[PDB]
Design a binder for this molecule. Sequence first.
Ligand SMILES: NC(=O)c1ccc[n+]([C@@H]2O[C@H](COP(=O)([O-])OP(=O)(O)OC[C@H]3O[C@@H](n4cnc5c(N)ncnc54)[C@H](OP(=O)(O)O)[C@@H]3O)[C@@H](O)[C@H]2O)c1
Ligand SMILES: NC(=O)c1ccc[n+]([C@@H]2O[C@H](COP(=O)([O-])OP(=O)(O)OC[C@H]3O[C@@H](n4cnc5c(N)ncnc54)[C@H](OP(=O)(O)O)[C@@H]3O)[C@@H](O)[C@H]2O)c1
Ligand SMILES: CN1C(=O)/C(=C/c2ccc(=O)n(Cc3ccccc3)c2)NC1=S
Ligand SMILES: CN1C(=O)/C(=C/c2ccc(=O)n(Cc3ccccc3)c2)NC1=S
Lengths: 381, 383
Amino acid sequence: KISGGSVVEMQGDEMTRIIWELIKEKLIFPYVELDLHSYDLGIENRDATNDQVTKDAAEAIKKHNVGVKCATITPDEKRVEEFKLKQMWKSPNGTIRNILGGTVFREAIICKNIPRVKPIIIGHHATDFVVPGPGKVEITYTPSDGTQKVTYLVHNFEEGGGVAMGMYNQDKSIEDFAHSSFQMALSKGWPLYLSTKNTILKKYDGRFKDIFQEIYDKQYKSQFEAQKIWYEHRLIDDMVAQAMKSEGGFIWACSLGMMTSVLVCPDGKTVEAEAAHGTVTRHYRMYQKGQETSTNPIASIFAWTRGLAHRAKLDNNKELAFFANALEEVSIETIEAGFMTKDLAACIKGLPNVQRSDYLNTFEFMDKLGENLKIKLAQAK
Amino acid sequence: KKISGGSVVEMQGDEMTRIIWELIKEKLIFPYVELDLHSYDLGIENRDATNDQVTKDAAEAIKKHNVGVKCATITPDEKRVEEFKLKQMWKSPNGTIRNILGGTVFREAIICKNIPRKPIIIGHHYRATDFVVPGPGKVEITYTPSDGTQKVTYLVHNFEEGGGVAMGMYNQDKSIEDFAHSSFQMALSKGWPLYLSTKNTILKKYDGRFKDIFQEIYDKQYKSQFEAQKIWYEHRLIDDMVAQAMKSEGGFIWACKSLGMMTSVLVCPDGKTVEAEAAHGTVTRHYRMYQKGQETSTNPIASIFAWTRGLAHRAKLDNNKELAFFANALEEVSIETIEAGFMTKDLAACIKGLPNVQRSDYLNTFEFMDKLGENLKIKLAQA
Ligand SMILES: NC(=O)c1ccc[n+]([C@@H]2O[C@H](COP(=O)([O-])OP(=O)(O)OC[C@H]3O[C@@H](n4cnc5c(N)ncnc54)[C@H](OP(=O)(O)O)[C@@H]3O)[C@@H](O)[C@H]2O)c1
Ligand SMILES: NC(=O)c1ccc[n+]([C@@H]2O[C@H](COP(=O)([O-])OP(=O)(O)OC[C@H]3O[C@@H](n4cnc5c(N)ncnc54)[C@H](OP(=O)(O)O)[C@@H]3O)[C@@H](O)[C@H]2O)c1
Ligand SMILES: CN1C(=O)/C(=C/c2ccc(=O)n(Cc3ccccc3)c2)NC1=S
Ligand SMILES: CN1C(=O)/C(=C/c2ccc(=O)n(Cc3ccccc3)c2)NC1=S
């Protein structure tokens, strides 16, 4: 078996919990041995430990660089009542993000037989108050050296009351955004585009464009030209214009079962992968009632494969990297071959025309991925 | 022999929308409706010659006669000033007319049963003071009452690490009240429910002000009439609102904090004044193809529906059931004509995919307008 390494695993809730254990059992463990740092982020254990499993998991990701997370219930009122929660805990994704930092990149997985060639990887990057009555709401900046004092008028209230707010943004955040954007662009080998309003908010987004150019020229221009890739700034409307008439395959800096979300830290060494969808509670209820479900596992599978690909990149693990690539291959090939779940069958033929004989249920699709994975790993090597 | 329309303010535009405009009137509106027409030529040449005075006059005429219908007008930039030898770079007519009439903009997409996906109407409530921070310092925001009361200073941020950027935003109470009013007026006009989505938790005081004002206006004015129509209002949050929206049959008005089918309507808070216009521009590419003598295929549905929304509002005001039925008949003739298979190149592309658009799949502009004239005559003959 392949020697994997140190990987932080986080288990989730409901249907994604089931698919998680299936993915490991039938796809991961039979071929890879891992120094696994498992953390049970189910809602009942998060309640029992008072989100301490969440904090611990986040710090463990900070130590071992690579994390793979399953979808976990985010509690609201009906959740607190359902599980008898001691408190309405904050989102574990929120906690982990507030401990690790970084920027989130969402990539959709494109099959050549599903209605939509190269995927677009989209990455996204305050004092409010009431104002009782008429008056002057100004915003003033005073440098630390006291050289000047600049005061702008947000609005002069003469009609009556209202509401106001002020926002800020330091340079280091924009520099981290550009860092992770260029690193992701070089890791995938696809060009990078930055889209902003830039004209409406003249001063605000122009800073983003400028910092992106400074970092690109002082660090990445050479390596980009050395990989048939580049960076370029555009505006939102023109970005949609060229986008709706392009082959695809670029990092744009601004069925759900196929969306993959990955948090990339600015230092470039720490990465957390997770499906972009939720716990699929409706299908989990169908599973509780003994009915037949059909949940696409591709998003969580790709969380595992991207996490393993990053672990392999860190450990110089050629075998494990080949394994992750092989599993992604088996997935896209299995769907393109015709075997898929009901959601993809609906994306193709439209819901009211979906016959049963057009899709497989969750366990059948997992079995098919297992067969094709064993075949692929035996023949491709 | 023709329907008595009423007082309507017309605004003429530029280029391809100008051509399609004259086609819509000549072949669809005038043969069946007589109007006390307040025409205003908002073309770039007349706006230049009169020094944008025709824009102010047209806006004031809409404020007086309640119903306005506008054609797409060029908003001039540098290449426009260079093209027309403009004396000045005039402001956007939508900007002027909107700053004189107030109100809230509602955009509705027209859904055909053969178009890649009940319609959803989205009304939107810009002036933000942003600046760059060069180095360390204190960025504060201060409110000072008019009655000489103590001034309250909040710290937006203290920069000690280095530079950055900052900005400030505001919103008066009257603006939020106009937004909620126009939202309720549109909700009762369409008979669909109304939803308000905000970041009520992150911006507690800011969006909480919106939620509160919306609820207060709902209770001390409406709610009774909503219950009198099997409809309601409800505040929600962004993500759950997208959840309910993206998984419903459609048919609700969402208040937020293909272009040939998009219709834009400015609704004033008073509920009487309404200005309708297509959500697209003057279609310069098609107008240049039209100048060179080439064959164009520009969808007129958006402008036609501008006319039908304006006329339907005029009929609703004057209690003109005949004119209201005419507007409904024209809307239905449009959607039915497209669903019958006759359409323009953009819709043919939405159906058959762009690289596979064969000519025999669409009609040119004049052919499609002729078809709408035929089907309008037939339907109005059957009624
Ligand atoms: N990191 C996390 O733990 C995390 C992040 C996101 C969401 N969530 C949690 O998920 C819970 C419920 O989420 P939700 O109600 O919004 O549903 P969801 O999981 O976000 O997805 C909603 C829809 O996705 C569809 N779906 C079908 N197959 C799927 C597949 N293989 N993968 C993903 N989605 C599939 C279902 O459509 P059908 O109607 O046809 O069944 C379902 O209605 C929430 O408590 C939320 O906190 C967890
Ligand atoms: N913001 C506005 O919409 C607005 C408001 C009032 C007046 N105007 C004025 O109208 C004038 C003409 O500008 P405009 O052509 O942009 O008006 P427009 O009405 O917004 O034009 C839309 C057109 O853009 C074209 N297009 C070309 N490539 C595209 C792509 N990759 N993605 C999406 N659409 C694409 C389409 O025509 P094809 O079928 O040929 O591709 C489409 O009909 C301007 O001077 C403007 O000031 C515009
Ligand atoms: C899908 N998804 C997110 O993208 C996410 C991130 C996030 C980060 C911070 C935060 O405050 N929230 C909102 C929240 C507040 C309190 C309790 C629970 C959630 C959410 N949480 C989830 S579920
Ligand atoms: C497409 N499109 C609009 O939808 C639009 C609306 C609008 C409404 C209010 C307003 O104050 N402005 C500001 C403005 C003033 C002068 C020139 C340009 C913009 C613009 N202006 C345009 S061009």
